[PDB]
Amino acid sequence: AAPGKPTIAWGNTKFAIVEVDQAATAYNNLVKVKNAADVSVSWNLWNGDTGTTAKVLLNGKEAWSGPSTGSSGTANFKVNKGGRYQMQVALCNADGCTASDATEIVVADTDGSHLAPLKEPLLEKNKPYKQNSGKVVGSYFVEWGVYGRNFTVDKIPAQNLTHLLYGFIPICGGNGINDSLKEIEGSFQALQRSCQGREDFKVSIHDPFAALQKAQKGVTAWDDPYKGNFGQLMALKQAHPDLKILPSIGGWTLSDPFFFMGDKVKRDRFVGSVKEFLQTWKFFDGVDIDWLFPGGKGANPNLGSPQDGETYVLLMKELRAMLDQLSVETGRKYELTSAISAGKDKIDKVAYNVAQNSMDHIFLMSYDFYGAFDLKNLGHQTALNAPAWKPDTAYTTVNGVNALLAQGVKPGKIVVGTAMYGRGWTGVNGYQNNIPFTGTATGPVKGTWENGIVDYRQIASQFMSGEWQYTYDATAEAPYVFKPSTGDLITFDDARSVQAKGKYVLDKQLGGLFSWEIDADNGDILNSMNASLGNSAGVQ
Numbered sequence: 001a002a003p004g005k006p007t008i009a010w011g012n013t014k015f016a017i018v019e020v021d022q023a024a025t026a027y028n029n030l031v032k033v034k035n036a037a038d039v040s041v042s043w044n045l046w047n048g049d050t051g052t053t054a055k056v057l058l059n060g061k062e063a064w065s066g067p068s069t070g071s072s073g074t075a076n077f078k079v080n081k082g083g084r085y086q087m088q089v090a091l092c093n094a095d096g097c098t099a100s101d102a103t104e105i106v107v108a109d110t111d112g113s114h115l116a117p118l119k120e121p122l123l124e125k126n127k128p129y130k131q132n133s134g135k136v137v138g139s140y141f142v143e144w145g146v147y148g149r150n151f152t153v154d155k156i157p158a159q160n161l162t163h164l165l166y167g168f169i170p171i172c173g174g175n176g177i178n179d180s181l182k183e184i185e186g187s188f189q190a191l192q193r194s195c196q197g198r199e200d201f202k203v204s205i206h207d208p209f210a211a212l213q214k215a216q217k218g219v220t221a222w223d224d225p226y227k228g229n230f231g232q233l234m235a236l237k238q239a240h241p242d243l244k245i246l247p248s249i250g251g252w253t254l255s256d257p258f259f260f261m262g263d264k265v266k267r268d269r270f271v272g273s274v275k276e277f278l279q280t281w282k283f284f285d286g287v288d289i290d291w292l293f294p295g296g297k298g299a300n301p302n303l304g305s306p307q308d309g310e311t312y313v314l315l316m317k318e319l320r321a322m323l324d325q326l327s328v329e330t331g332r333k334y335e336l337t338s339a340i341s342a343g344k345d346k347i348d349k350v351a352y353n354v355a356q357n358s359m360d361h362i363f364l365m366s367y368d369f370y371g372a373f374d375l376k377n378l379g380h381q382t383a384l385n386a387p388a389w390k391p392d393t394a395y396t397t398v399n400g401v402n403a404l405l406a407q408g409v410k411p412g413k414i415v416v417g418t419a420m421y422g423r424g425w426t427g428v429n430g431y432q433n434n435i436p437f438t439g440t441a442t443g444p445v446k447g448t449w450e451n452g453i454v455d456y457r458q459i460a461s462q463f464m465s466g467e468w469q470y471t472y473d474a475t476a477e478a479p480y481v482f483k484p485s486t487g488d489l490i491t492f493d494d495a496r497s498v499q500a501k502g503k504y505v506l507d508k509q510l511g512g513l514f515s516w517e518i519d520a521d522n523g524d525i526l527n528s529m530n531a532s533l534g535n536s537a538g539v540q
C-alpha cells in the first residue's frame with residue numbers, strides 16, 4: 001500500500017529572489033539580487049508507512065526529492081521564478097505516492113509576480129477612459145508625496161494613463177556635486193545617507209523608506225519584502241501590464257551631476273549603474289532623463305557650459321546602446337525619454353533632431369513660463385498661445401514646439417505638457433486695462449505646500465468663489481483667477497485649456513500629453529487630457 005498522508009510543519013512561507021533589508025539606509029546595503037530563492041519545508045507523518053522517497057511539489061511539479069527516512073523530514077531547495085505556489089510534500093514507494101494538503105509559499109521577485117493586482121477604484125472626480133487613441137497620456141508621481149501631500153500609488157487613476165513617471169531618482173555625490181539639494185530641509189543629508197559607501201555619479205534611491213519600506217495598501221504585512229512606492233508599483237504592473245512605468249533621473253534639484261558627465265569616465269559609470277538598476281528593479285520599463293538644463297540656467301548658478309549640448313547627445317546614444325544590450329539579454333523592450341525646457345533659448349543649446357534617433361518620447365515642459373520667480377514680468381505660466389495684449393510673448397507652448405520642429409524633430413516624438421498646479425503672485429498692482437498681468441507683484445501667493453504654488457485641487461475648491469474673479473483667455477487659451485483686494489493672481493491650466501492643447505496635438509500630429517504632478521489634480525485635468533486626445537469613455 002502507498003505511504004500515509006503527511007502534514008506540513010509550522011514555518012515561514014515567504015521567500016525572495018531579490019532581497020531587501022527593511023532597516024537599511026544605505027543603498028549598497030538595501031538590496032541584493034540572487035539567482036534564486038532558498039526555500040525550506042518540513043513535514044510530519046504521525047500515522048502510516050513513510051515510504052522510501054520524499055518529494056516536494058510546486059503546483060504539482062517536482063522541485064525536490066530524496067530518501068524518506070522517518071516520521072519527519074526537511075527539504076531545502078531553490079526556486080528561480082517568482083510567484084505564489086501551491087506546495088505539497090508527497091511520500092512515495094513502489095505502491096504509489098501520497099500527497100499532503102497544500103500550503104501556499106510565496107517567492108518574491110521585483111517584477112511583482114508574487115503580488116495580487118493592485119486594482120483600485122477611481123477617486124474624486126476621475127472618470128474611466130480606454131487607451132485607444134494611440135496617443136501618449138502621462139503623468140509624474142513624486143516619491144516624497146507620501147508624506148506631507150499624503151498621496152500614494154493606490155490613489156493614482158492608473159487606467160487613465162499610458163505612461164507613469166517616477167520622480168526623482170538621484171545621482172550620488174556630495175559637496176560641489178549636489179549643492180542644489182541644500183535648499184530643502186534634510187534633502188542633501190538624506191542623499192548622503194543613501195549613497196554611504198557608494199561611488200559618486202552612480203544612481204541610487206533618494207528616500208529608501210518611502211521607496212521600499214513604508215507600509216502601503218497591498219504591501220502592508222510586517223514581513224512583506226517590498227513595500228513603499230516600489231512595492232505598490234510592482235502590484236500596479238500586475239494590474240496594468242501595458243502601462244509603461246519609468247524612473248526619472250534628475251529634476252530641478254537633482255540635475256547638478258549631469259554637468260560633469262562631459263568626462264567619459266563619469267558618464268560610463270553612470271550608464272553602467274542605470275543598467276544594473278534596471279536589472280534589479282524589473283518593473284521599470286526604461287529610463288527618463290530630466291537634465292535641467294544643458295547649458296545652465298538651472299538651479300545652480302555656477303554650472304553650465306557650451307559643451308553640454310554634445311554631452312547630452314552622447315549620453316542619449318550611450319543609454320540607447322546600453323538598453324539594446326539589455327534587450328538582447330532579457331528579451332524585453334525598453335524606452336528612453338527625456339523631459340526638457342520649453343524655452344527656445346534653451347532648446348537651441350541642444351541638437352534634438354539628432355538625439356531623437358535614440359529616444360521614444362520628448363516630454364516638452366510647456367509650463368512654468370512665468371511665476372513668482374519674477375515679480376516684474378507677469379504672464380500665463382502654461383498657455384498655448386501669446387495673449388492679445390502682447391502677441392510677441394516669447395514663452396508659449398507653440399513657440400516651444402516650433403523650435404523643436406524647426407530643428408528637424410519629428411512631430412510624433414513631441415509630447416506636450418499640462419500643469420496640474422497654478423503659480424501665483426500677491427499684491428499685484430499698477431496694471432492697465434483690467435489686465436492684472438500688466439502690473440507688478442510684491443511677492444508669491446500663499447501656496448498649498450510651498451510658496452507661489454497651488455494645487456489645481458485647491459484652486460477649484462477654494463478660489464472659484466467669494467471675491468475671486470475668474471477669466472478664460474481665449475486668445476492664449478489659459479484661465480486665471482484674481483482677487484482685487486489683496487492683489488492675488490493665479491495662472492493655471494483647466495479643463496478647457498487642456499482641451500485646446502489636446503486638439504492642438506491631434507491637429508499637428510504630435511505624440512500626446514503629459515502632466516506634473518498627478519497628486520495635485522482632482523480629476524478634471526486628466527479627464528480632459530484623455531477626452532481631448534480621442535480616448536473613449538468606459539472601462540477597458
Ligand SMILES: CC(=O)N[C@@H]1[C@@H](O)[C@H](O[C@@H]2O[C@H](CO)[C@@H](O[C@@H]3O[C@H](CO)[C@@H](O[C@@H]4O[C@H](CO)[C@@H](O[C@@H]5O[C@H](CO)[C@@H](O[C@@H]6O[C@H](CO)[C@@H](O)[C@H](O)[C@H]6NC(C)=O)[C@H](O)[C@H]5NC(C)=O)[C@H](O)[C@H]4NC(C)=O)[C@H](O)[C@H]3NC(C)=O)[C@H](O)[C@H]2NC(C)=O)[C@@H](CO)O[C@H]1O
Nearest residue numbers: 144147148149251252253290339343368369373395449450
Ligand atoms: C520658459 C522658461 O525658461 N522659464 C523658466 C522656468 O522654466 C524656470 O522654472 C523652473 O522650470 C522647471 C521646468 O523647466 C521646473 O522643473 C520641472 O517642473 C516641475 C514643476 O515646476 C518641477 O517640480 C519641482 O520639483 C522639485 C524637485 O526637483 C520639488 O521639490 C520638492 O519640494 C517639496 C516641498 O514642497 C519637498 O517635500 C518635502 O519632502 C520631504 C522628504 O524629502 C518630506 O518629509 C516633506 O514632508 C515634504 N514637504 C512637503 C511640503 O510636502 C521635496 O523634498 C522636494 N523634492 C526634491 C527632490 O527636492 C518641487 O516641489 C516641485 N515644484 C512643483 C511646482 O511641483 C520638476 O523638478 C521639473 N520636472 C521635471 C519632470 O523635470 C522648476 O521647478 C522651475 N523652477 C522653479 C524655481 O520653479 C524659472 C526659474 O528658474 O525661470 C524661467 O525663466
